[PDB]
Design a protein around this nucleic acid. Sequence first.
RNA 1: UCUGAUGGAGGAUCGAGUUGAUACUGACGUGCAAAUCGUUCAUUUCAAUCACGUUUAGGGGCGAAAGACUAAUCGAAAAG
RNA 2: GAGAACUUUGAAGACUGAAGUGGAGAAGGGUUUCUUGUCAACUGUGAUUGAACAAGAGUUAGCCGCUCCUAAGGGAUAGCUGAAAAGUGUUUAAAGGGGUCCCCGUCUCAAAAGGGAAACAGGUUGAUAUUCCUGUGCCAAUAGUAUUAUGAGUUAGAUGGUAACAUAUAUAUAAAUGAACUCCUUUACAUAGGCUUUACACUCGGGGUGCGUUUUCUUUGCACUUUACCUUUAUAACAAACCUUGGAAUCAAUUUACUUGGAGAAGAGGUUCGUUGAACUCAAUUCAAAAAUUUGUUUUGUAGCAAUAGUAAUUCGUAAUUAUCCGAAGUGGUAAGGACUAUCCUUGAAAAAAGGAGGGAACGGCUUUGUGCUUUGCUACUCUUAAUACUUGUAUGAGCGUACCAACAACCGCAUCAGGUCUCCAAGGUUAACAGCCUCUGGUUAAAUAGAAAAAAGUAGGUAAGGGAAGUCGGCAAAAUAGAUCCGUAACUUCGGGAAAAGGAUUGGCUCUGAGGACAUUAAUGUUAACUCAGAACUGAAACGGACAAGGGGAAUCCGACUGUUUAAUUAAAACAUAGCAUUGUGAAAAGCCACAACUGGUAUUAACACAAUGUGAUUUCUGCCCAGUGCUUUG
RNA 3: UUAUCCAUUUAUAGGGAUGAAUU
Lengths: 247, 85, 43, 72, 106
Amino acid sequence: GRVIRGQRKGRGSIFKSHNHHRKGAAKLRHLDYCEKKGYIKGLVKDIIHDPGRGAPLAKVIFKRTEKYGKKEELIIASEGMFTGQYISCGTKAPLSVGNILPIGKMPEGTLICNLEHRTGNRGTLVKASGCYATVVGQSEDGKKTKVRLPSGAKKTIDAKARAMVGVVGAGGRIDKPILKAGVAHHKYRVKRNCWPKVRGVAMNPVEHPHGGGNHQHIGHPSTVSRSAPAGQKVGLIAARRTGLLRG
Amino acid sequence: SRRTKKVGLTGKYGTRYGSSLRKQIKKIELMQHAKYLCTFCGKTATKRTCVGIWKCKKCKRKVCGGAWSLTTPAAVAAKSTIIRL
Amino acid sequence: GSIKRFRLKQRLGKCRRQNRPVPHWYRLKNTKRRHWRRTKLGL
Amino acid sequence: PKQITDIRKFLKISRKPDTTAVIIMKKKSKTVITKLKLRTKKYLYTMVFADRKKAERIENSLLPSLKRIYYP
Amino acid sequence: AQRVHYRRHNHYNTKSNKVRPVRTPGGKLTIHVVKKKAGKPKCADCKTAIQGVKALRPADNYRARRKNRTVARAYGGSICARCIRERIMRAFLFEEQKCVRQVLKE
RNA sequence: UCUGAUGGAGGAUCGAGUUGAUACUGACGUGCAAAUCGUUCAUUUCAAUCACGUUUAGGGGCGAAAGACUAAUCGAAAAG
RNA sequence: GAGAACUUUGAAGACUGAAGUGGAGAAGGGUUUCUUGUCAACUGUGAUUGAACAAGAGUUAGCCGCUCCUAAGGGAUAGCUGAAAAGUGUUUAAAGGGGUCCCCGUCUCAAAAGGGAAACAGGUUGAUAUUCCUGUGCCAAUAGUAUUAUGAGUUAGAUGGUAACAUAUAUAUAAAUGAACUCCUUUACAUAGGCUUUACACUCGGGGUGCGUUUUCUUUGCACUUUACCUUUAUAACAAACCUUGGAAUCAAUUUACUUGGAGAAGAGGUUCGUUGAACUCAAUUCAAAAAUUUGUUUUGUAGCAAUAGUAAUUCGUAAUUAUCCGAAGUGGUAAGGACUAUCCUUGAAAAAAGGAGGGAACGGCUUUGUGCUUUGCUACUCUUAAUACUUGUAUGAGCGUACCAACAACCGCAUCAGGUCUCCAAGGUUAACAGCCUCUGGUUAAAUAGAAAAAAGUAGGUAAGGGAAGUCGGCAAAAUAGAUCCGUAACUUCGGGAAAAGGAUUGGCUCUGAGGACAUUAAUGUUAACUCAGAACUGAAACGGACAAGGGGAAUCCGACUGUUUAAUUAAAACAUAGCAUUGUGAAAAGCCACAACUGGUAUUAACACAAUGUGAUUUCUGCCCAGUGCUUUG
RNA sequence: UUAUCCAUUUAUAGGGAUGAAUU
């Protein structure tokens, strides 16, 4: 056979992210003595739209403490923040919508966004539009907390990790139905080359293990092993179960 | 008079797509573009500005919000719990 | 084209100068001729 | 060029050592009048008139030390 | 109808090659392509062009006229009128607020 | 509630151009042409069309998937 | 000319015909360009022609482009792999600049359609022209002293305005100080819809300049009538920005549309940016009244370039002169601008370069004490624009491209091949129209041939009595109305459609008639611009969107929901895709999927409303039983 | 924590009670 579409995806020739109009990487403020030992307030000057993602970004201007001037940061906006307000970052910053705090400072049960799964990644987890995590526990000795991620999984992160208090903006984006192929085309044109899909069962047997035959059927079980090679991992990868769920 | 008895804004879609699908976007069309209320001016005139960016017709100051609503039921509850503390 | 590089123009001039026939006084004592339409010089 | 009628500036510009060209029109208003054009290094300064006496006043007010040429 | 002819060596119509023909003293319709009009400096608060200025391209602004660069209030190229008056009546407001707070702190 | 009274949305309609190629299985088939000509037909606000520049190279690429295209060469190009 | 259907000239008849064999176009070609000469071969016929052959000649730039900047990206450096070849390009940059110690900072290439210093008109050649000439300008650059001037501000810096607003018209509106350090703005940006302005385009009647039938008639059929770069032109209106003030309810200005407002509106007063760049007396003036200068009324101008340059008709050494060159408008064809509204799970690019600002290191001179500082006398002062004269290298202005074709024979198709190959332009008539059809500027009357005859047959068409699919696998092909107005329009349906359903009448002609805007007078009378309706006539060969231009419908069945895509050159589909539905894996740099020989990398400028892997394929209604078999997965 | 590996940055301040702000 020949190299299948999935294997060709990793070469990065035409499958690179279409990122000509992106406004910058969404990163939290880099850790500093001021943020470790108190609040620093920077004002969000304008909420903009990043073409790749659905969640709007915010252009937060902070004032640098080691030099005269200001530094601009691109931060994923929480649902409910507006231009012209001061947002506070640090351990001693008050808890409020949009504020960035160490995880082990806020009480349990609060909703967080722009999570930092390891102290210093300036924002790693919970970043898609409408997503949020919930802090569901703090260790007695501190230095450790438990959060529930939007996937429904519990993760233990150290208390010094930072996060924004609130919910990522542009929530419910998947609610409206994409009426036509045109909206999907325009959506993926600014993201990737993942569309259209084309069934593997409609291909020839050379380009896809599903392809071939006189009746357009898979022919062999579509649950492939986790140890399957690059050209074999094509069906339901290491599926624990199949069919409709029952809750 | 009243040209569309029930279809309303979805008249731009004609007969294409499913009736239930057009009627499911009928749950959302009356509110994506609708004139909702701003909290810095006081006129029920807010309009969709982007996927998440929002603006009314008086303040000229944009606000991060829901995909097609100024506020989301999750985000009003989350804010309320935080405010309560 | 009406816009060209200096080296290209010089080579065109050299080819034009090379396309002339043998002097008659020398013949009294050429096969490398090209027509602009028949054979292209491939530049 | 500039349609200028104020005579104070016109007598002011009489001390510029760069104006050389003087051209006289002869146009029938309905009466024979003229438009007097003088050379200016940045403008084609021609003056439109309304009185033949004023035109004759100006055409001798010209400083005669330099060249004379008329289109017709 | 008469017939037209191109000059500028940019023989594709782009927003730097917009054409207007006008009649010339020779009696034929020659070409006249305009410069691109430039934008104006605007409001940092409510997104409105600043006033007291004109919108010449950087090459011309290098030689522009000064009195049509800034309207008469301090800065000049800062902010529009109804949005500068807000800061104007806010300045001593905030100063007095901090003063009364630091006075009545006890 | 309807009637009457007002506008300018749509991967809306006809339709030249543009992009194609339904049928005559017409002509041609020692052709104008190693794919053309005539009539007919599809398409025209968008998943639209074109140009230049640029990226992806051969058991590889690319493919809205035809074993399609990759310089008249493809169920493994061409040169040695 | 030896020789002429296919060389030239004149006449005629015609065509291209508003989307051109017309001008400019770029790739590509490279002298095919021009003049002169010439015909051995070629120019599939002739040929005296020619893109052939031969000799000469022809391409002139500070302003047009490249050159400069940055994008998709390419190469290279540091490393790191690899035997190297090569693979990736900060993965422990010590990488040039800045100002006066510190701050910033991989290099380089990549756009003749992206950004961008500044040029227009007339004329000129056998061949080049916004390049040559004449004239008029514009932009960038310009080192050290002495003279000037203008204007400012001052013995280190202005003006009014209740406000918005505006603020210097010398040769040019230059003349309202300024470091390090920063913060902005311009550059700089999508699509759709209509409204409006302006130039250009076209057009109308009467004033200035030429041809014509006229058997039968003519205020007869018509034809030729200008103004670049340069000036904030002022204006004014209009679109927006912006203050006072009224302080609205019997809410209000309003837009084609909705917009806006008690954070301020009727209403009133007041003030810029944006346009065409003469429109309103604009520039004055004759004269009057306000007043130690304004307002009105009359003469000049094609508002200033501007006519004199160009252009056009009669006389006229064979070189000249003439005068015209005007009141106005009307349509909306093409462009640009403005203010708006609407759309996106689509938000529609960077630098070079330039400008503004916060702040304030430093600010009047001569000489004079001591060591950049306190001090003694006079206070004249200093800069913004322009230069002038001597020293530095000489103190303006590099290099390259500019001819021609762009296909109709100069490009690619083996060729002088009916093929392929990147913008603008459209008058009338007709029109909805840049459609089609005839013509007007421009171009052509040529196509690897011409006569004559004209049968079969072929091919591209036309017309056919009566029948009307009986033909044929199959109504294949052709015909049938098809524009427009009035009327009328079913089943079914997702209520949106079906629908131009189906189905009718009319449209010919001229004589007619009537109705529907802007300008003025103390309810009425005058100046001046539409194409929409209606009824009475008769009349014409009872026939008429007269040519061109243009849907055949209906009842059902099968498939696919739809728009879209596909086997370049036998299959355009029921195939693919598609939104919808459903499943699976993955919480991360010790993850999922994938690439790589290693190093390392793509997704990823990402983070479960995400990415990856699948199947089914609008909507509606459903999606049953079986885990034994094979797979996948989980515990011990 | 010293080998080793990972993340962040300008490797930019020791632990407890919608305007600016550099010399």
